[PDB]
Amino acid sequence: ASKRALVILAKGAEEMETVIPVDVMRRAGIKVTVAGLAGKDPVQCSRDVVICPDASLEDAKKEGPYDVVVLPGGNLGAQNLSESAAVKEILKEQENRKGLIAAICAGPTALLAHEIGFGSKVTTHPLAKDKMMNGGHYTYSENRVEKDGLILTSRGPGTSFEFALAIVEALNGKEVAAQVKAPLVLK
Amino acid sequence: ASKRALVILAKGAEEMETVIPVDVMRRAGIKVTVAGLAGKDPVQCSRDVVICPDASLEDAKKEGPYDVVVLPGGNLGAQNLSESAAVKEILKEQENRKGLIAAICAGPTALLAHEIGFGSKVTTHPLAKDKMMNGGHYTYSENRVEKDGLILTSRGPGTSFEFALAIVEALNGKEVAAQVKAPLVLK
Ligand SMILES: [Cu+2]
Ligand SMILES: [Cu+2]
Ligand SMILES: [Cu+2]
């Protein structure tokens, strides 16, 4: 069967970090659900792009489990993810079932908020490093994409393609990732 | 005053090629209007991301002139742009007033449809080359971004950051482009 991705979309999400992985994952034949944290209403992203989610998180959570849960960045978006009890539950369940969690930019700070994957080597946006490292619960990396088992992290809008292709490789393999990559005109 | 950008959004537009330039231009302090070709209703992009435009093209056209008109790609999006009388009028006026026109991926084929910038050196997505070159009205380039005077073109999702930063440099200069570039974590 096809793999399934849940992308959690909150007000203030970085729209490039949301759209690039959604699009690339769909190119890879992954069934992606864009789930609105606050409900099924349009979401105003960090640079004012307005995205209509496929479903509310409340509804999407009922259609699990997912092979990857994806957390976009954006400072304010990540803060919303970090404050959400629903997100905490989803990430705990995903970690418990040994499913992939992928977070980019400020997104990984939601892992810290929900005590997910402590001990992992992680990266974040440079400006989110101090927040992520509060308490020393992770080991920091400057790699553009970092993967430590089932915790996959990345740095910013400019690493979003690498991040998305790493998700594709983890779910559908190296060959599919290479096939999806070529028409993008990367490098 | 601030520079102004019109981004024309049609069904089937490549969402990465729409969102990356909108976001990057807004980071550069450009006033960007995302205008829906078909009206103010949500637009279903090529990989099913749904974007709510800021205004209909019909309304946005009345708020000109713009310092750049931006045409995203996506095969079906570009076909819609190519078939639009409103787009033809907008591009003709922009060319006539010596304003920048920027098109990415399949987007430049709309320039061909509306007889804009003939003689220019241009690039497109590799799969859109034959369409763009029908009749030999342009000279083709494999550069990731090509700028020939006021006609700025680029190749695909993976060149969208370069394309957007080239627009920023053209409008707001090299220093602003460099300032906007650094927090993106490109390369
Ligand atoms: Cu970011
Ligand atoms: Cu919408
Ligand atoms: Cu394209």
Reading the block at residue A19, the tokens are 């759209």
The pair of structure tokens assigned to B178 is: 């460099």
Q: How far is the CA of A81 from the centre of ligand 3 (A)?
A: 31
8 Å CB contact between B10 and B80: yes
3-state secondary structure of B175: helix
Single-letter code of the amino acid located at A94: Q
User: A139 vs A69, A132, B171, CA distance in Å?
Assistant: 21, 10, 41
Would you name the residues of B annotated as active-site residues? 105, 125
B139's enclosing H/E stretch is strand B139-140
Q: How many domains does chain B have?
A: 1
Examine residue A65 and say whether the peptide bond preceding it is cis (omega within 30 degrees of 0). Answer: yes
A21 touches chain B (CB under 8 A): no
What is the stated resolution of the deposited model, in angstroms?
A: 1.6
For residue B32, the distance in angstroms to the closest alpha carbon of chain A comes to: 10
Q: What are phi and psi of B73, to 5 degrees?
A: -100, -145
The answer to whether B78 touches B107, Cβ cutoff 8 Å, is yes
Domain of A60, CATH number, reads 3.40.50.880
Amino acid sitting at position A24: V
Q: What is the DSSP string of A17-34?
A: HHHHHHHHHHHTT-EEEE
Q: What element of type H or E holds A86?
A: helix A85-96
Residue of B72, B60, B56, B68 lying closest to B2 (CA atoms): B68
Amino acid at B83: E
Mutate to test the interface with B, among A34, A51, A143, A162 (most CBs of B within 10 A): A51
- List the one residue out of B151, B154, B150 whose CA is nearest residue B128: B154
Cα four-point dihedral sign A157, B168, B105, B60: positive
Residue in B19, B52, B184 nearest the CB of A156: B184
> What is the sign of the dihedral through the CA atoms of B161, B166, B169 and B170?
negative
Structure-determination technique? X-ray
Structure-block tokens of residue B186: 């490109």
Contact between A126 and B185 using a beta-carbon 8 Å cutoff: yes
* Max Cα–Cα distance, chain A, nearest Å: 42
Q: Amino acid identity of B99? A: G
Distance (Å) from CA B38 to ligand 2 centroid: 14
Give counts: helices (H), strands (E), chain B. Answer: 8, 11
Looking at all shown ligands, the one closest to residue A126's CA atom is 1
Contact between B34 and A49 using a beta-carbon 8 Å cutoff: yes
- Residue B75's CB is within 10 A of a number of other CB atoms, namely 17
Report how far residue B94's alpha carbon sits from residue A54's, in angstroms, rounded to the nearest whole number: 36
Residues B46 and A150: their CA atoms lie apart, in Å, by 30
What is the span of the domain harbouring residue A163? 1-187
What is the C-alpha separation between B147 and A140, in angstroms, rounded?
40
Of B52, B127, B185, the CB nearest to A42: B52
CB–CB of B16/A184 below 8 Å?
Answer: no
Q: Which residues contact A160 (CB under 8 A, 6 or more apart)?
A: A16, A17, A20, A21, A104, A154
Chain A, residues 99-158, CB within 8 A of chain B, namely: 125-127, 144, 155-158
CB atoms within 10 A of CB A57: 23
